[PDB]
Coordinates of N, CA and C in Angstrom, one line a residue:
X242 N 78.4 -13.9 8.0 CA 77.1 -13.8 7.3 C 77.3 -14.1 5.2
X243 N 75.8 -15.2 5.3 CA 75.8 -16.0 3.9 C 75.8 -15.0 2.4
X244 N 74.5 -14.2 3.1 CA 74.1 -13.6 1.6 C 75.2 -12.5 1.3
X245 N 75.9 -11.7 2.8 CA 77.2 -10.9 1.3 C 77.7 -12.1 0.6
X246 N 78.3 -13.4 1.3 CA 79.3 -13.7 -0.3 C 78.6 -14.3 -1.1
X247 N 77.3 -14.9 -1.2 CA 76.7 -15.1 -1.8 C 76.0 -13.9 -2.9
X248 N 76.3 -12.5 -2.7 CA 76.1 -11.1 -3.0 C 76.7 -10.5 -4.0
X249 N 78.1 -10.9 -3.5 CA 80.0 -10.5 -4.4 C 80.5 -11.9 -4.5
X250 N 80.5 -11.9 -6.1 CA 81.3 -12.7 -6.6 C 82.8 -13.2 -6.2
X251 N 83.2 -12.3 -5.2 CA 84.6 -12.2 -4.9 C 85.5 -12.6 -3.6
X252 N 83.7 -12.9 -2.9 CA 83.9 -13.3 -1.6 C 83.2 -14.8 -2.0
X253 N 82.4 -15.2 -2.4 CA 81.6 -16.5 -2.8 C 82.8 -17.9 -3.5
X254 N 83.3 -16.4 -4.6 CA 85.0 -17.6 -5.6 C 85.6 -17.9 -4.0
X255 N 86.4 -17.3 -3.5 CA 87.7 -18.0 -2.7 C 86.7 -18.8 -1.6
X256 N 85.5 -19.0 -0.9 CA 84.7 -20.0 0.1 C 83.9 -21.5 -0.8
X257 N 83.8 -21.3 -1.8 CA 83.9 -22.5 -2.9 C 84.7 -22.7 -3.2
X258 N 86.4 -22.5 -3.3 CA 87.3 -22.8 -3.5 C 87.7 -23.7 -2.4
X259 N 87.5 -23.1 -1.2 CA 87.9 -23.7 0.0 C 87.1 -24.8 0.1
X260 N 85.6 -25.0 -0.1 CA 84.8 -26.6 0.4 C 85.3 -27.7 -1.3
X261 N 86.4 -26.6 -2.2 CA 86.6 -27.4 -3.3 C 88.4 -28.2 -3.2
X262 N 88.6 -27.8 -1.9 CA 90.2 -28.0 -1.1 C 91.3 -27.6 -2.8
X263 N 90.3 -26.4 -3.3 CA 91.6 -25.7 -4.4 C 91.4 -24.9 -4.1
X264 N 91.4 -23.9 -3.2 CA 92.4 -22.4 -2.4 C 92.1 -22.6 -1.5
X265 N 92.5 -21.8 0.2 CA 92.9 -21.7 1.1 C 91.3 -20.9 1.8
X266 N 91.2 -22.0 3.3 CA 89.9 -21.9 4.3 C 90.2 -20.9 5.4
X267 N 89.6 -19.9 5.0 CA 89.2 -19.0 6.1 C 88.5 -20.0 7.9
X268 N 89.3 -20.0 8.9 CA 87.7 -20.1 9.4 C 86.7 -20.9 9.2
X269 N 85.9 -19.8 9.0 CA 84.5 -19.8 8.7 C 84.4 -20.4 7.7
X270 N 85.1 -20.4 6.8 CA 85.4 -21.4 5.5 C 85.2 -23.0 5.6
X271 N 86.3 -23.3 6.4 CA 86.7 -24.4 7.0 C 84.8 -25.1 7.3
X272 N 83.9 -23.9 8.2 CA 83.1 -24.6 8.7 C 81.7 -24.5 7.7
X273 N 81.5 -23.3 6.7 CA 80.7 -23.9 5.8 C 81.5 -25.1 5.0
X274 N 82.4 -25.0 4.3 CA 82.8 -26.7 4.1 C 82.0 -27.8 4.9
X275 N 82.0 -27.5 5.9 CA 81.9 -28.9 6.9 C 80.3 -29.2 6.5
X276 N 79.1 -27.9 6.4 CA 77.5 -27.6 6.4 C 77.2 -28.3 4.9
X277 N 78.3 -27.7 4.0 CA 78.1 -28.1 2.5 C 78.6 -29.7 2.2
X278 N 79.2 -29.9 2.8 CA 79.8 -31.8 3.0 C 78.6 -32.3 3.3
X279 N 77.9 -31.8 4.4 CA 76.9 -32.6 5.4 C 75.9 -32.2 4.6
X280 N 75.2 -30.9 3.6 CA 74.5 -30.3 3.5 C 74.1 -31.3 2.0
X281 N 75.5 -32.0 1.2 CA 75.0 -32.7 0.7 C 75.3 -34.1 0.6
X282 N 75.5 -34.7 1.5 CA 75.5 -36.1 1.1 C 74.5 -36.9 2.9
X283 N 74.2 -36.1 3.7 CA 73.9 -36.5 5.0 C 72.7 -35.5 5.4
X284 N 71.8 -34.6 4.3 CA 70.9 -33.4 4.7 C 70.8 -33.2 5.9
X285 N 71.8 -32.1 5.8 CA 72.6 -31.4 6.8 C 72.6 -32.0 8.2
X286 N 72.6 -33.3 8.5 CA 72.1 -33.4 9.8 C 72.7 -33.2 10.5
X287 N 73.9 -32.8 10.7 CA 74.9 -32.2 12.3 C 74.6 -30.7 11.7
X288 N 73.5 -30.1 11.4 CA 74.4 -28.9 11.4 C 72.8 -28.0 12.0
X289 N 72.7 -27.0 12.6 CA 72.2 -26.2 13.5 C 70.7 -26.0 12.4
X290 N 69.8 -25.6 12.9 CA 68.8 -25.0 11.9 C 69.2 -23.1 11.5
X291 N 70.3 -22.8 11.6 CA 70.7 -21.5 11.3 C 71.7 -22.2 10.0
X292 N 73.0 -23.0 10.7 CA 73.7 -23.1 8.9 C 72.7 -24.6 8.7
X293 N 71.3 -24.6 8.5 CA 71.2 -25.2 7.3 C 70.5 -24.2 6.6
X294 N 69.6 -23.1 6.9 CA 69.8 -22.1 5.5 C 70.2 -21.0 5.5
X295 N 71.3 -20.9 6.2 CA 72.7 -20.6 5.3 C 73.0 -21.2 4.1
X296 N 73.3 -22.8 4.3 CA 74.0 -23.7 3.4 C 73.6 -24.0 2.4
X297 N 72.2 -24.2 2.4 CA 71.1 -24.2 1.8 C 71.4 -22.6 1.0
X298 N 70.9 -22.1 0.9 CA 70.6 -21.0 0.2 C 71.8 -20.5 -0.5
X299 N 73.4 -21.1 0.0 CA 75.0 -21.4 0.0 C 74.7 -22.0 -1.1
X300 N 74.3 -23.2 -1.4 CA 74.3 -24.4 -2.6 C 73.4 -23.7 -3.4
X301 N 72.4 -23.5 -2.9 CA 71.3 -23.0 -4.4 C 71.7 -22.0 -5.1
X302 N 72.9 -21.5 -4.8 CA 72.7 -20.3 -5.4 C 73.5 -20.6 -6.0
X303 N 75.1 -21.5 -6.0 CA 75.9 -22.2 -6.2 C 75.2 -22.8 -7.8
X304 N 73.8 -23.9 -7.2 CA 73.6 -24.3 -7.9 C 73.1 -23.9 -9.4
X305 N 72.8 -22.8 -9.1 CA 71.7 -21.7 -10.2 C 73.1 -20.9 -11.0
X306 N 73.8 -20.5 -10.4 CA 73.9 -19.2 -10.9 C 75.6 -19.4 -10.9
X307 N 76.9 -21.2 -10.2 CA 77.3 -21.0 -10.3 C 77.8 -22.6 -10.8
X308 N 76.9 -22.4 -12.2 CA 77.0 -24.3 -12.2 C 78.3 -24.8 -12.1
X309 N 78.8 -24.3 -13.3 CA 80.4 -25.2 -13.1 C 81.3 -25.7 -12.0
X310 N 81.2 -24.5 -10.9 CA 81.5 -24.9 -9.4 C 80.5 -25.8 -8.7
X311 N 79.0 -26.0 -9.0 CA 78.4 -26.4 -8.9 C 78.1 -28.1 -8.9
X312 N 78.5 -28.4 -10.3 CA 79.0 -29.9 -10.7 C 80.5 -30.3 -9.8
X313 N 81.6 -28.9 -9.4 CA 82.6 -29.8 -9.2 C 82.3 -30.0 -7.9
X314 N 81.0 -29.5 -7.2 CA 81.1 -30.2 -6.2 C 79.9 -31.2 -5.5
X315 N 79.3 -31.3 -7.3 CA 78.7 -32.9 -7.1 C 80.0 -33.8 -7.0
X316 N 80.8 -33.6 -7.7 CA 82.2 -34.6 -8.1 C 82.8 -35.1 -6.8
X317 N 82.6 -33.8 -5.8 CA 83.4 -34.1 -4.9 C 83.0 -34.6 -3.8
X318 N 81.6 -34.5 -3.5 CA 81.2 -34.7 -2.5 C 80.1 -35.3 -2.7
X319 N 79.6 -36.4 -4.2 CA 78.5 -37.4 -4.6 C 78.7 -37.4 -6.1
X320 N 80.5 -37.9 -5.7 CA 80.7 -39.1 -7.1 C 80.2 -39.7 -7.4
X321 N 79.3 -40.9 -6.8 CA 78.3 -41.9 -7.4 C 77.2 -41.6 -7.6
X322 N 76.7 -40.2 -7.0 CA 75.6 -39.8 -7.8 C 74.6 -41.2 -6.7
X323 N 75.0 -41.0 -5.6 CA 74.5 -42.2 -4.6 C 73.7 -40.9 -2.8
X324 N 73.6 -39.4 -3.5 CA 73.2 -39.1 -2.1 C 71.9 -37.5 -2.6
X325 N 71.3 -37.6 -3.9 CA 70.1 -36.7 -4.4 C 69.4 -36.8 -3.8
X326 N 68.7 -37.9 -3.3 CA 67.2 -38.4 -2.5 C 67.6 -37.5 -1.1
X327 N 68.9 -37.3 -0.5 CA 69.1 -36.7 0.7 C 69.4 -34.9 0.6
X328 N 70.2 -34.7 -0.4 CA 70.5 -33.0 -0.7 C 69.3 -32.6 -2.0
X329 N 68.0 -33.7 -2.2 CA 67.4 -32.7 -2.5 C 66.2 -31.9 -1.9
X330 N 65.7 -33.2 -1.1 CA 64.8 -33.1 0.0 C 65.2 -31.8 0.9
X331 N 67.1 -31.8 1.1 CA 67.4 -31.0 1.9 C 67.4 -29.7 1.3
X332 N 67.2 -29.2 0.0 CA 67.3 -28.6 -0.5 C 66.0 -27.7 -1.1
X333 N 65.0 -29.0 -1.2 CA 63.6 -28.0 -1.0 C 62.9 -28.1 0.1
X334 N 63.4 -27.7 1.1 CA 63.2 -27.3 2.2 C 63.1 -25.8 3.3

């Protein structure tokens, strides 16, 4: 449940660190990690419509409220800043 993770920063941070290889991943975490990586580089091309709305909400909450962690996600998944068209069009829908 995406909304409960983003509503409690004590759940969100472990999930963020999971996608950053900075902390350990629950089975759900590794899958959110997979969709965020896909949401950031390939427009969530392999995500279900369910995984798109949830990954969109997570990435955008992090972008707006967890900027520090947002920029680390950008450093991990788009170091050359070549995927902006992909994840901005994804995040804008």
